[PDB]
Design a protein around this ligand. Structure first.
Ligand SMILES: Oc1ccc(-c2ccc3c(-c4ccc(N5CC[NH2+]CC5)cc4)n[nH]c3c2)cc1
Length: 281
């Protein structure tokens, strides 16, 4: 069924599938690193469950193809290889030993809210992620699922944009389907995505604002106490989240600018990068 692409193809005899982290498992990939071709490199492998749908398979194939076209960056989980032939589809990606940003932040919370993090650590985290999105945007990629749970942290605390399952080319949003943007978590979605069936880089900027609010609240849930059923109405009425606890007015203004009603009046990722560098220096 799946064509050949031997630049990306990786032998199935050299992949030992370990414990779970579709389903993702810890694996050892012997010779996946070009410069050390005998050593067992720890990677992440995404595959189908036994109860998978036709959509699950085209989603996974779509995700793989997306990660080949976007290329290489410090602040995105990078495609390492793929087993496409002669058995189950395996999509092989970088292992990030400290897991998702949400649990990473919640675990480092000071006591009494129910290694700790500095203001600068939270600004640095946001800045890493803005650089990741500046690259993705420049590669014509819209992510469509920016959230803390879809950021992974490496052993060295590097922030990696993950879960390209919903990612598209900019020119591959269907204005002429009702179902377009139907599988995006609504609490992270720009209103134009919710309503008008569009999605631009400026839709991702809105999401990145929500990610910022998650970062500065140390892994808090957006619109606390507000059901997704009521959020649609509160947004068109112009509701916006209030400032996180130890967060400066400045970074709150940044979140608020990401949540402008008009997509083209929101800042670009390039502008967020410039501004976050000045605050981090
Ligand atoms: O489409 C997808 C592509 C990649 C991944 C994915 C998910 C988890 C990981 C992980 C990962 C690494 C460590 C953890 N841990 C959390 C901390 N203790 C146990 C290890 C969890 C997840 N590394 N790389 C990944 C890629 C998920 C969906």
């Amino acid at each position: 069924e799946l064509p050949e692409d031997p630049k990306w193809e990786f032998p199935r005899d050299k992949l030992t599938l370990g414990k779970p982290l579709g389903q993702v498992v810890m694996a050892e990939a012997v010779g996946i690193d070009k410069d050390k071709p005998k050593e067992a490199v720890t990677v992440a492998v995404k595959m189908l469950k036994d109860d998978a749908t036709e959509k699950d398979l085209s989603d996974l194939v779509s995700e793989m193809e997306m990660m080949k076209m976007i290329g290489k960056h410090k602040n995105i989980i990078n495609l390492l290889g793929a087993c496409t032939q002669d058995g189950p589809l395996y999509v092989i990606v970088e292992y990030a030993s400290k897991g998702n940003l949400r649990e990473y932040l919640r675990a480092r919370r000071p006591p009494g809210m129910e290694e700790q993090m500095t203001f600068k650590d939270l600004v640095s985290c946001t800045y890493q992620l803005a650089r990741g999105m500046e690259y993705l945007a420049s590669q014509k990629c819209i992510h469509r699922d920016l959230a803390a749970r879809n950021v992974l942290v490496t052993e060295n605390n590097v922030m990696k944009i993950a879960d390209f399952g919903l990612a598209r080319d900019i020119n591959n949003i269907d204005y002429y389907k009702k179902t377009t943007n139907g599988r995006l978590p609504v609490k992270w979605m720009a209103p134009e995505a919710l309503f008008d069936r569009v999605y631009t880089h400026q839709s991702d900027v809105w999401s990145f604002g929500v990610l910022m609010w998650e970062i500065f609240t140390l892994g808090g849930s957006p619109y606390p106490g507000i059901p997704v059923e009521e959020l649609f109405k509160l947004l068109k009425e112009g509701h916006r989240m209030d400032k996180p606890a130890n967060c400066t007015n400045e970074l709150y203004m940044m979140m608020r600018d990401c949540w402008h009603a008009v997509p083209s009046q929101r800042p670009t990722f390039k502008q967020l990068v410039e501004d976050l560098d000045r605050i981090l220096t």
